[PDB]
Amino acid sequence: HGTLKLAVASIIGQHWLPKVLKTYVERYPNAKVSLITGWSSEMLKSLYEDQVHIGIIRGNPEWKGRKDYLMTDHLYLVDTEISCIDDIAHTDRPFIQFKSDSTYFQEIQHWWHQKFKTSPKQTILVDQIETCKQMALHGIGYAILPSVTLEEEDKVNKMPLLDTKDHPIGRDTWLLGYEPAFELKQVQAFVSVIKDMLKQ
Amino acid sequence: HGTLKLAVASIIGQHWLPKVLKTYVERYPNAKVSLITGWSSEMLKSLYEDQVHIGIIRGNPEWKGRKDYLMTDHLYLVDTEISCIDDIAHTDRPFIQFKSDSTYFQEIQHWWHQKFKTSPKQTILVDQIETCKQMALHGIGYAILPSVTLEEEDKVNKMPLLDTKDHPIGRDTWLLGYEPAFELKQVQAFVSVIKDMLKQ
């Protein structure tokens, strides 16, 4: 029962993985866990280069190994004052806007263009989603966040992002590895903890 | 006015920078900000390669431009169960350790060797500090965090780390940047806002 090496997308590492690691540690005391985090592209690279056993990756990664769908969450435009999502096309509050090399940024641009037929205000550009949340909780402006980072208790208005046909805009999260990893007892225990937690 | 390109150490970007940025947007509407985060070394290296105007770096960075001391925070051990820091030399409760290329990790090994005359049991190694905090908040184990990441709303016991000679153990945060950037106007209004902030 050796060391489990994980490469996990940042918002997952922050918001979803802790509860999984709690159960993993509860069932397997003193099992060693090594965790790196970051952009999805970076964690995929790490997994591709044999540096970890398992990647948890968002988006739609192409992968010639084992790939398990985990979950989907949906985008919300959050703000402290604005209550109605149509006002966002006129307000003077800045668009705090996450941007990495994933498709998250492009897809919000596409939604904005289609819904409002205008372009959004490239004022504040941030390279990590959690800083967007924080900056938005502090009233600086509004933000578009995946619901995996939101809680009901968050003092901020929650406005569903819907496409032109009123369908919530989603993002997927996958678990990825090559066959040798899945033969390891600690990888298998971790996967088993995950596929337990998904039914909750 | 011009667009301010910041590089901030991750924990600063999340915990300290949002209030600094709120005031800066409050006094300067339509002023654009662009923010990359990460390890101090990575933001130092980016500042050196002219990608940003201003770096907010942690530790003791060597720098041959302008270096403004900013603040000092102190290391706290946190756990949901453990209330006395001497308990940890004897607990099967796991140790959640942040580790990067900065001195942070070896600083803590040194304090531990010098206080408990033993080595800490490495079970959980993670590569970003906020992930340590969350995993500590989730009761998984104890962590050692800088106070800038802590709040009283954080439902964990917080225990100050003191060296062999009764003294709290600190890390500093600086503000670096080459002379030209400080000529630029938005940099001056941001350096300003910071220093007028710090006056409580």
PDB file of C-alpha atoms in Angstrom, chain B residues 21-149:
ATOM      1  CA  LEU B  21      -7.706  45.726  -5.293  1.00  0.00           C
ATOM      2  CA  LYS B  22     -11.164  46.716  -4.086  1.00  0.00           C
ATOM      3  CA  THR B  23      -9.779  50.060  -2.957  1.00  0.00           C
ATOM      4  CA  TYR B  24      -7.832  50.440  -6.207  1.00  0.00           C
ATOM      5  CA  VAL B  25     -10.938  49.858  -8.361  1.00  0.00           C
ATOM      6  CA  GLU B  26     -12.978  52.025  -5.982  1.00  0.00           C
ATOM      7  CA  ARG B  27     -10.711  55.027  -6.574  1.00  0.00           C
ATOM      8  CA  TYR B  28      -9.985  54.254 -10.243  1.00  0.00           C
ATOM      9  CA  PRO B  29     -12.984  52.991 -12.217  1.00  0.00           C
ATOM     10  CA  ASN B  30     -12.292  51.626 -15.705  1.00  0.00           C
ATOM     11  CA  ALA B  31      -8.687  50.955 -14.698  1.00  0.00           C
ATOM     12  CA  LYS B  32      -7.690  47.532 -15.931  1.00  0.00           C
ATOM     13  CA  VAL B  33      -5.815  44.986 -13.813  1.00  0.00           C
ATOM     14  CA  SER B  34      -4.173  41.764 -14.968  1.00  0.00           C
ATOM     15  CA  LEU B  35      -3.116  39.219 -12.368  1.00  0.00           C
ATOM     16  CA  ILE B  36      -0.971  36.096 -12.453  1.00  0.00           C
ATOM     17  CA  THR B  37      -0.409  34.103  -9.226  1.00  0.00           C
ATOM     18  CA  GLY B  38       1.773  31.217  -8.110  1.00  0.00           C
ATOM     19  CA  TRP B  39       4.885  30.379  -6.145  1.00  0.00           C
ATOM     20  CA  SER B  40       7.124  33.266  -5.082  1.00  0.00           C
ATOM     21  CA  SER B  41       9.958  31.906  -7.221  1.00  0.00           C
ATOM     22  CA  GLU B  42       7.665  31.705 -10.281  1.00  0.00           C
ATOM     23  CA  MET B  43       6.430  35.262  -9.780  1.00  0.00           C
ATOM     24  CA  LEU B  44       9.988  36.448  -9.125  1.00  0.00           C
ATOM     25  CA  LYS B  45      11.119  34.795 -12.368  1.00  0.00           C
ATOM     26  CA  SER B  46       8.207  36.318 -14.299  1.00  0.00           C
ATOM     27  CA  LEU B  47       9.015  39.782 -12.887  1.00  0.00           C
ATOM     28  CA  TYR B  48      12.613  39.329 -14.024  1.00  0.00           C
ATOM     29  CA  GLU B  49      11.477  38.486 -17.582  1.00  0.00           C
ATOM     30  CA  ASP B  50       9.421  41.717 -17.915  1.00  0.00           C
ATOM     31  CA  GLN B  51       6.019  39.979 -18.001  1.00  0.00           C
ATOM     32  CA  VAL B  52       4.615  42.168 -15.191  1.00  0.00           C
ATOM     33  CA  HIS B  53       5.079  45.646 -13.731  1.00  0.00           C
ATOM     34  CA  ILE B  54       5.176  44.660 -10.054  1.00  0.00           C
ATOM     35  CA  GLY B  55       5.819  41.451  -8.131  1.00  0.00           C
ATOM     36  CA  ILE B  56       4.563  40.756  -4.613  1.00  0.00           C
ATOM     37  CA  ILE B  57       6.985  38.053  -3.493  1.00  0.00           C
ATOM     38  CA  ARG B  58       7.442  36.117  -0.268  1.00  0.00           C
ATOM     39  CA  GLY B  59      10.585  35.209   1.619  1.00  0.00           C
ATOM     40  CA  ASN B  60      13.858  37.097   1.085  1.00  0.00           C
ATOM     41  CA  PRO B  61      14.159  37.658  -2.662  1.00  0.00           C
ATOM     42  CA  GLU B  62      17.420  39.003  -4.022  1.00  0.00           C
ATOM     43  CA  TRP B  63      16.495  41.921  -6.303  1.00  0.00           C
ATOM     44  CA  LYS B  64      18.418  44.715  -8.025  1.00  0.00           C
ATOM     45  CA  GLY B  65      15.638  47.199  -8.557  1.00  0.00           C
ATOM     46  CA  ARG B  66      13.253  48.647  -5.987  1.00  0.00           C
ATOM     47  CA  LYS B  67      12.306  46.412  -3.040  1.00  0.00           C
ATOM     48  CA  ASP B  68       9.638  47.649  -0.612  1.00  0.00           C
ATOM     49  CA  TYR B  69       9.083  45.690   2.575  1.00  0.00           C
ATOM     50  CA  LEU B  70       5.339  45.212   3.012  1.00  0.00           C
ATOM     51  CA  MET B  71       4.431  43.037   5.999  1.00  0.00           C
ATOM     52  CA  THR B  72       5.309  40.052   8.158  1.00  0.00           C
ATOM     53  CA  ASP B  73       3.089  37.180   9.223  1.00  0.00           C
ATOM     54  CA  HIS B  74       3.672  34.226  11.523  1.00  0.00           C
ATOM     55  CA  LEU B  75       3.299  30.463  11.355  1.00  0.00           C
ATOM     56  CA  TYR B  76       0.389  28.750  13.096  1.00  0.00           C
ATOM     57  CA  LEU B  77      -0.298  25.059  13.531  1.00  0.00           C
ATOM     58  CA  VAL B  78      -3.991  24.343  13.022  1.00  0.00           C
ATOM     59  CA  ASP B  79      -6.112  21.290  13.782  1.00  0.00           C
ATOM     60  CA  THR B  80      -9.750  20.643  14.565  1.00  0.00           C
ATOM     61  CA  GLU B  81      -8.970  18.325  17.503  1.00  0.00           C
ATOM     62  CA  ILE B  82      -5.441  19.109  18.749  1.00  0.00           C
ATOM     63  CA  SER B  83      -5.371  22.168  21.017  1.00  0.00           C
ATOM     64  CA  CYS B  84      -1.799  21.934  22.416  1.00  0.00           C
ATOM     65  CA  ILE B  85       1.170  22.056  20.080  1.00  0.00           C
ATOM     66  CA  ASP B  86       3.139  19.570  22.184  1.00  0.00           C
ATOM     67  CA  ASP B  87       0.501  16.923  21.378  1.00  0.00           C
ATOM     68  CA  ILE B  88       1.723  16.595  17.807  1.00  0.00           C
ATOM     69  CA  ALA B  89       5.015  14.862  18.643  1.00  0.00           C
ATOM     70  CA  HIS B  90       2.868  11.874  19.700  1.00  0.00           C
ATOM     71  CA  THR B  91      -0.234  11.888  17.501  1.00  0.00           C
ATOM     72  CA  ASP B  92      -1.269   9.440  14.811  1.00  0.00           C
ATOM     73  CA  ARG B  93      -3.207  12.390  13.417  1.00  0.00           C
ATOM     74  CA  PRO B  94      -1.627  13.044   9.987  1.00  0.00           C
ATOM     75  CA  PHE B  95       0.549  16.027   9.071  1.00  0.00           C
ATOM     76  CA  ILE B  96      -0.555  17.902   5.927  1.00  0.00           C
ATOM     77  CA  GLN B  97       2.579  19.638   4.621  1.00  0.00           C
ATOM     78  CA  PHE B  98       2.873  22.321   1.991  1.00  0.00           C
ATOM     79  CA  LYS B  99       6.039  21.911  -0.048  1.00  0.00           C
ATOM     80  CA  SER B 100       7.453  24.093  -2.807  1.00  0.00           C
ATOM     81  CA  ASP B 101      10.867  25.345  -3.885  1.00  0.00           C
ATOM     82  CA  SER B 102      10.786  28.190  -1.306  1.00  0.00           C
ATOM     83  CA  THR B 103      12.361  27.972   2.157  1.00  0.00           C
ATOM     84  CA  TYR B 104       8.910  27.503   3.751  1.00  0.00           C
ATOM     85  CA  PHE B 105       9.103  23.711   3.884  1.00  0.00           C
ATOM     86  CA  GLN B 106      12.653  23.368   5.182  1.00  0.00           C
ATOM     87  CA  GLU B 107      12.034  26.167   7.688  1.00  0.00           C
ATOM     88  CA  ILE B 108       9.345  23.975   9.234  1.00  0.00           C
ATOM     89  CA  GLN B 109      11.416  20.777   9.213  1.00  0.00           C
ATOM     90  CA  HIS B 110      14.120  22.749  11.053  1.00  0.00           C
ATOM     91  CA  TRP B 111      11.745  24.090  13.720  1.00  0.00           C
ATOM     92  CA  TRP B 112      10.352  20.592  14.139  1.00  0.00           C
ATOM     93  CA  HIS B 113      13.748  18.898  14.448  1.00  0.00           C
ATOM     94  CA  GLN B 114      14.771  21.574  16.964  1.00  0.00           C
ATOM     95  CA  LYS B 115      11.561  21.364  19.060  1.00  0.00           C
ATOM     96  CA  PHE B 116      10.721  17.659  19.110  1.00  0.00           C
ATOM     97  CA  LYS B 117      14.175  16.170  18.364  1.00  0.00           C
ATOM     98  CA  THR B 118      12.639  13.851  15.785  1.00  0.00           C
ATOM     99  CA  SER B 119      11.424  13.891  12.262  1.00  0.00           C
ATOM    100  CA  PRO B 120       7.815  14.621  11.372  1.00  0.00           C
ATOM    101  CA  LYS B 121       5.947  11.806   9.647  1.00  0.00           C
ATOM    102  CA  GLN B 122       5.364  12.868   6.021  1.00  0.00           C
ATOM    103  CA  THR B 123       2.044  11.391   4.884  1.00  0.00           C
ATOM    104  CA  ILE B 124       0.280  14.146   2.938  1.00  0.00           C
ATOM    105  CA  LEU B 125       2.403  16.399   0.723  1.00  0.00           C
ATOM    106  CA  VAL B 126       0.656  19.144  -1.260  1.00  0.00           C
ATOM    107  CA  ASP B 127       1.927  21.841  -3.559  1.00  0.00           C
ATOM    108  CA  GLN B 128      -0.239  24.820  -2.581  1.00  0.00           C
ATOM    109  CA  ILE B 129      -0.996  26.311   0.795  1.00  0.00           C
ATOM    110  CA  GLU B 130      -4.749  26.909   0.441  1.00  0.00           C
ATOM    111  CA  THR B 131      -5.182  23.170  -0.206  1.00  0.00           C
ATOM    112  CA  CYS B 132      -3.461  22.461   3.114  1.00  0.00           C
ATOM    113  CA  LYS B 133      -5.832  24.839   4.878  1.00  0.00           C
ATOM    114  CA  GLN B 134      -8.941  23.200   3.363  1.00  0.00           C
ATOM    115  CA  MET B 135      -7.727  19.715   4.241  1.00  0.00           C
ATOM    116  CA  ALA B 136      -7.071  20.922   7.787  1.00  0.00           C
ATOM    117  CA  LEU B 137     -10.510  22.572   8.008  1.00  0.00           C
ATOM    118  CA  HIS B 138     -11.972  19.209   6.871  1.00  0.00           C
ATOM    119  CA  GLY B 139     -10.449  17.615   9.983  1.00  0.00           C
ATOM    120  CA  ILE B 140      -8.092  15.416   7.965  1.00  0.00           C
ATOM    121  CA  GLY B 141      -5.005  16.399   9.910  1.00  0.00           C
ATOM    122  CA  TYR B 142      -2.964  19.298  11.155  1.00  0.00           C
ATOM    123  CA  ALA B 143      -1.220  21.864   8.980  1.00  0.00           C
ATOM    124  CA  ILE B 144       1.148  24.802   9.422  1.00  0.00           C
ATOM    125  CA  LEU B 145      -0.128  27.943   7.663  1.00  0.00           C
ATOM    126  CA  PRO B 146       0.914  31.606   7.626  1.00  0.00           C
ATOM    127  CA  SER B 147      -1.504  33.774   9.588  1.00  0.00           C
ATOM    128  CA  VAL B 148      -2.406  35.801   6.493  1.00  0.00           C
ATOM    129  CA  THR B 149      -4.473  32.736   5.437  1.00  0.00           C
TER     130      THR B 149
END
